[model samples]
Structure formats: structure tokens, C-alpha cells
Target: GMAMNIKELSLHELCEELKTPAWNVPLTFVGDVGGTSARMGFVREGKNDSVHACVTRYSMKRKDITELIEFFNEIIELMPASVIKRVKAGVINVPGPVTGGAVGGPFNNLKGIARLSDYPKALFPPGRSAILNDLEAGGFGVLAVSDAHVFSEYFGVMWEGTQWRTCEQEPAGSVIGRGRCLVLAPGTGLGSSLIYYNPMNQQHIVVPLELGSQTIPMRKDIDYIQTLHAELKLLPNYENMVSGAGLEFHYRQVVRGSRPPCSAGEIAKLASEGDANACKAMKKYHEYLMRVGSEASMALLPLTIVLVGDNIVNNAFFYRNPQNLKEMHREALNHEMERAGFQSRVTYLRQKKLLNLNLMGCYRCGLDL
Candidate 1:
């Protein structure tokens, strides 16, 4: 046999056998364990940047965390043993809250018996692996990708001394936070988080948000939305109108037919093909997304707003048409801002989908750990 004992080999001999240039440097195992599906990869940091390798979607439908560890084992088995040995840390971003490396505090989505604890130690060797909220990881993902340059200049813009003093003196106060940004990722559902950049320290703080759980008020324009919400016993949250399922729900509301509802993908495709009902539904979806973004901006006062998710990334119809969906988004957002008396205009950065963003972000977190 051609196998050699790794421990018996000298350091240089082992390096030669593995053909590794930087055997001392460790690799990172990064994964975005989402609600719909999971994406995983190996992140190897080079001199200037990190290279993502063997990036693929692990498509098991079950949302159990126990299987997640097994899934990691399967992938690791296929990879080079040398590479696997080099992995010093792992970061798996999950859909629910992550506390002390365990996920799903009160509402566990992984279907684990332990409602609060998830991501067992078996996922990695021992102490370096951790689970993070998907949106919180997405917040770091934004830092990894340069797509936020859409409003990059506005993010670190300086404020006047008097403006700061005036705000301090006013009892009403101001909501302007120069280096803050709110990221809204509407994939299977709406996931939101905030990123605060401290220019002096050159560090970023990622804050996870569960704003999707908040309920949406009755729609004045569409009376049937509330009626249907009551009928279905749905709370009518932002996710109900702005996410993948939300898109389908909006289409069903618009069609008002006895036939089965269209899937989000089917509805998007139909909208692009100029189907009347699909168009209406997509328009409504766009408006609702804008409203949610605007309202979230009011609360956080983030100078820049970044929107990225499977819905926006996969479907160009949401942001491609300037006179249609894009215009509607601006109008709805501006209308809400004007009504709320929020004078600052929040710039939106709608980057094209970087599929490996969450994984890349996890790798970034590993750098800190």
C-alpha cells in the first residue's frame, strides 16, 4: 500500500507528502445552514484573501442539527485527509438564535430534542467551532463582499459638530448613526440584522434581529389581505408578504381562485412573462418589502441599507425593471419616510447574489476566533 504514517513522518516530510506550502496555516470549515437548504465549503486563507473550495449545496431537506454533524462528516470524508487535518475551526450559521454555540433558544427549528441547545461538539474537534445566526452572519458576509459599495461613501460620511450638538440638546433626539447599516435578507423568510462600523477602531459590530416575528398591520389598499389573514389565522408578518412563501401567498390573494397556489419561483417566472395576476402579486410584494425596509431604517437609522436574499438574488424581476418594481420600491419607501417625518434618505445597496456569502462570512468569523 502507498499510505504513510502521518505522525511518524517528520514535519518537512509530512509537508512534502501533503504538498502543502503553508502547513502551519489552518483552514476553516464554513457553512450556511439555512431554513430551505444548506451551503458548505472549505475556506483557505491566502496572503491577501481567502480561497473557497469544494463549495456545494448539501440538499438534505430535514432541518435537524444532528444530521448536520453527519452531513459534515460526509463532506469531510470526501475531502483530502490532509486538508481536513488543517481545518482548525468551523462556523455554521443557522436560521435561529445561537447562544453559547447552541442554537434555537426558545424556538428550535432544527427539530432537536433539546429546544435550546443545538450544534453539538461533535461538529468539530472541540472548542473552535460555533453556530451563528444566519442574518448576523450575513451582516459579516456584507463585510466580506465589496457589493455594499453601492452606498459605501455614505456609510462613513462625517457629521457636522453642530449637528451632533443640536441633536444632543434636542429632547426628541436624532436617529442618524453614520456608520450603521441594516441588512434585510428575505429568503425562505425575512431575516434582518444590523452592522455598526466604528470608524476609529475599524471594527464592525453585527447585531442579530428577529424583526420577522413582528406582525404587519392591515393593508388599506388590499382589504382581502386582512380578511385572508384572519381566515388562515396568520399573524400577517413581514415574512408573510415579502419572502418566498410570502410571494406565493400574495399571488394566491391576487388570483383568488380555487386552484392550488403557485410556487414563488413559478410566480416570479410568470410575472416576467407578463401574467396579470403574477405582475400584481410581485408589485405588491415589492411594495411590502420596501415598507418593511423603510420602517426598519426608521428604527435603526442605519445610513446604508443592504438587501440580499434568495428572492432578490434569484429573481431579477424584483429589481431589474427601473420603471416598474424599482420605482415602486422607491416610491413606497419615500412615502413611508415622509409620513414618519424621517428626513434622512436611506441609501439601499441591492447587490447581486453572492451564493457563498454566508459561508465566506463564517470564515471571516473564524478569523476572529
Candidate 2:
């Protein structure tokens, strides 16, 4: 109902039961800044409900940290002098490859924002900051909150295998393998990542990937214009068929129809209103999403597959039926577990993204680094 587990409290109320220096329980600022919007706010260490209470949106009109810093100045000026002096740090999740504490690259999805770094010194006391790959931040979020007991008890996958992609549900003994997991975020573009694990070293890390760009070989029967594959060589590409843009890609390329340059969200509207081509394209979108999920489960043998983003969040169009999409996602992924061979029971999280999971990870990064 409320967040899985959260206790709401005001400064005055929270202080009644807690005893610590303001600096000890510092207010960390976290962000999920993307090409379209920037979601961020002041929160306590590990606190995400911080923004569950309010707001329209937050960000830098220009996607770079520079413009954000200018905006940050305002947040700073608005802070109470007493609270301002005790701020702990800042952690940002930006759309880019995060390496060595820096958010970098041409920032493919964003423009004029060449790069970003984890050095928002003025905000975080002692000039500390953590800039992380937005998706990586989410990966850490899940790991941080995951408990061994949960898996042992309520844990289960979609098909009949283990988290490692085998077909034996609740295997004979202890859980096996690296416990790799996946995050499938459907948004302006479809995004996926593998949370690979190395139990030998006891370190969990996000295996960076360009999921949307990956090509999916299509079945001739799946395409609208069967022979179009010969002309344009069309395939049911991951990003091309699933993301918001992918919806348009399916319509323009597969449906082979004329419609203004419309977004996935746009196509969905037309579909609901009974537009034939849009409806067909949407059906194809669901099919491909399921296809990818199945393949992902087999490849990574993840114990859990989390779905996130406003695009697919509440849209029944994807999951469609209660047992259908959710269960199908697991089966599709675990279907063969392998073109090679394996077993697993993949778990699918609800549409709600771990909104603050990444924020918490980045916040902790700032604290530790």
C-alpha cells in the first residue's frame, strides 16, 4: 500500500525518538536525471519516501551538471542555515556511462550535456560527491535491500527452475550461482542491464550493457510486411520494437503505414481509441517485450527481473492480464533457460521502479567515497 516498508516522520517528530548529530544523520541529495526530466530531492541517508509526499518535477533545463549546479544554488539558498551546515553529500544518477566516479560520454540520450562527474563539492560536506550510471544506481538499490532470508522464504521465479535459469523450483539445497538479476526499464527507449554477481569475491556489481541497441533476429511470420525484411531488412530489434521509440519503429517499419512521427505514448492512445495499425503495433510491442524477457532470463538466469519506468508502469497493455504478462515474463525468460541448456524460476517485480534504490546507492557512494 504505502512503500513496501517506510515510516513517515517530521523533523520534530523524528527527533523525538532519534538521538544523533544532524551531521551524523545527514540529509543526502539524490537525483535520477534523464534526457527528459530530472527527479531529485533532499533525503535522509537511505530514505526514499522523501519525495513520495509532493512536487511536479525537478531538474536542469539543460541536462548538464553545470545548469544543475546553478539550480542547486537555489536549493542551497533555500536551506535553513542550521540544516545547510550539516549536509552530508550528494549523489547523482545521470544518463551516461559512470566510471571512476564520473558520469561521462557524449551522453547519447542527452544533448549539449557532454559529460558529468561526482564532484558536487559545495553541497556535500568536505566536497564529496558520487556520480553513478543511473541504471547502475538502481542495480545497487536492489542489492542493498535484498535479504538472503527473503529468497529462502518468499523467493520464486516464473518458470520451474532456480534463479540461475534451471527448471528445478526450490532446488535441493542452498541457492546456487552468482545470483545475477536484471532490470528491464521501458521508457523513451527500452533499457536493460544485468546485475552480475561474483560470490567468490562477495561483491555484486552492475554489468553495463547497451540492451536497446541489441538486435533480435525476427521470425518471418512476426513481421507485418513479410517480404519487407528483404527490402529494408527489418527485424524485431529490442529497442526498435519495445521502447516508446520502438513503438514508432514498429509502426513505421513493420506496420508500413503512414502516421505522423508519433511517440510510443502517442501510439498507445491511438490504439486504445481503436486505431487498427496502432493496435497491431502495440500487440507486437508486447510480444517482443515478452520475447526479450524470456531470452534475458535464459542468458543471465537471474533470480529476479524488475520492470520500471512511466511507460510500462501501470499500462496493462504490456502485462495485460494479471497472470499473463507477469507469469509469461518468467516463462518466456526461463522457457529454454538456454539455447544451450539450464534451469531457473525468474521473479518479476511490479511495474513500480526502485525509484530511490539508485538514489540510496549514490547517496551511500558519496558517504563512503
Candidate 3:
């Protein structure tokens, strides 16, 4: 299905037609630039969330910041002139950290990129835009898109009165403390952020975090695991073992120089076919995922931990079906929490379909500008 264009209907009709609650909010320009793709679009704020229209360009991993702006220009050409005029501000979501409107820290993509505030005036709402970490934007995207009326299934954990239970499909109204949530994205990079929903006003505040750069805590007793950890440069972070690149890295190590390296997608297929080496690589990857999820949960104690990205979504069977591993993923997490006597249960959720989450998130961020 195509995204509903803001210009396709009058504001009142769009709000009524989509059941969106806000009718007078300005339309904002939004972009999500990841390691491999760049998604561009427009959004109109709604009291509950926002409406979005977007397009994607793949293989963006090879492009620099200037080329990325050129891609944005192409997207702008495709928008209605009236909509463009109404776009008062723009927001771009990048893979790395953002500090003072500048892209900071090392990233697999967008090396040495200029501040998004300096994007050429040829772009929409010239000189009125901001930059955000993709994961930070994703946290906002959760606020914009995770509505039970719009999305069929919601992934999360619930306090069942007696114990914390993992919820693959949390029922509406049954959810307690729906205001606070966490968004954890494991893709080309591991990204995380916290979203606090204010029920009184129906708005959200995003607290960005750089969890991917932290050193991964591996099992010291496992010699093979230690050996694999050794291959990484000093200070191997979660991105080294819990991301798409990490999966590929593990697969290479599992084969022990026996065959050519394969992409994460290829490894997934092999694992599905019962290839021993691929299975081993994926097993470790799952462990790393579990560890990271637990760590993030400890810090935030959120009502739900929404897992977004190809890694979590693609291999969901590992968690949903215990047959894929020694024990169910959620069970492992629950057991750990139980041992610690923790009261709050962390719910894990994955979107049934891949949304341009960061793009939608960027749109939400633009509303503040």
C-alpha cells in the first residue's frame, strides 16, 4: 500500500479519514539515513502520532553526505509544491550520534558528514532542520506508529500480577503503564533510546542513548567465545556481536577460514537449512542479543522493549520458538530477572512489518523545531 500523501486530502479530511487527532499541525520533511539505505518523506503531526509518506534508496552505504543531500533533492522533486511550501522544518536521522547539530563519533556510513543544519537551501524549509541518531528517531517512531488501531500486533512485556510475562501480542486496554517504553534496534549498528509518554497530554519525550559503543560482556568461561572476542580490535562493542555486521563476523569465525565470507542474510539462510557452522554463529548472535536486552532492561525498567531492525525481526523464531535454541529467549531473560528478584518484567515486541521507523521518527523530531 502507498503512503497517504498530505496533499491528497484537506487537513480536516485527512485527519478524519485517517482518524488522526491533530488537524492543524504543519507538515515537516523527514529523512532516515542508515548504513545501507536512505529513506525520505513528509509527515503531518497528529495528537496521537503523525502521518507519513516516504521513498527509499538502497545501497546508500557507499554515498557521502553531499551525495545523500542530492538524494534528498530527488525526493523533494517528487513532492507537491504546496506541501513543500508548508514544510517549515526538516530532520535527518543518521546511524551515529548527534551532538550540537553535527554528526559525531565513528559510523560505518556518513563519514565526516557536515552538520545537517548546513544542508543546502535547495532542500525543503531551507536552514530550518536538525540531525538525530537513527535509534533516537526510532524511539520517536515507536510513539508515532505503535497504535493498536493502526497496527495489528504489539510486542511487549506485562506485569501479570504474580510474575512478569513476555507479551507477543499485548491486548489494548489491558496494558498497564503504557506511557514509558524503550526502543532497541539491532541492524548494521545497535541503537537504543527511551521514550516517555505523558498520558495527560498524549505526547512523548525521547532520551537518546549510545548503547552500541559499550564493550560487550562475553562469557569468560567459554574459550571459543573468548577466542572470537579476541579477533575484534580493542574494545569490541555490542555492535561487534549483536548487529548485522556482527552476525557476518561470527559466521566467518565459525567456519574457521574454511570458506569465503558470507553476508548476514546468507548466513541466516544457511542456518535455516541446518548448516552446523551457520547454526553455531547464529547461536552466539542470539546470546549476545539476550545479554544486550537484559542490560538495557536493567537500566530503563521500561514497560516494554520494542525490538526494531532486520536482525531482531528476521530471526524472531529464535525467541518465539525455543526449538531454535537450547531454551526460549524470553524464558532465559525471565529466569535471569527472577534470580535477581527483580519485580518489573520487561516486554519485548517486534513489528509485524518493517516500517520506515527512523523516517517516521525523524518526522516526530521535526515537530519540535
Q: Which pairs of residues have clashing backbones in candidate 1?
A: none
Best of the candidates, TM-score? 1
TM-score, predicted candidate 3 vs. hidden true structure: 0.73
* Candidate 3, 90-162: lDDT as tens digits: 8888767778755544576566664665565535454567788777788776665654234333333322222
Model 3 stretches astray by more than 4 angstroms:
1-26, 35-37, 44-50, 56-62, 68-81, 101-108, 120-128, 147-179, 196-203, 218-220, 233-236, 248-263, 317-320, 325-337
Candidate 3 at residue 249, lDDT?
A: 79
lDDT of each: 0.61, 0.56, 0.61
- Residue 249, model 3: Cα distance from true site in angstroms: 5.4
Candidate 1 local lDDT, 92-157, one digit each (tens): 787666677645433255565222234333335466776777777888776654322212321222
Give the higher-lDDT candidate: 1 or 2: 1
In lDDT terms, how accurate is model 1?
0.61
Residue 187's lDDT within candidate 1 is: 72
Candidate 3 local lDDT, residue 297: 71
RMSD of each: 8.9, 6.1, 6.2
TM-score for every candidate vs. truth? 0.74, 0.70, 0.73
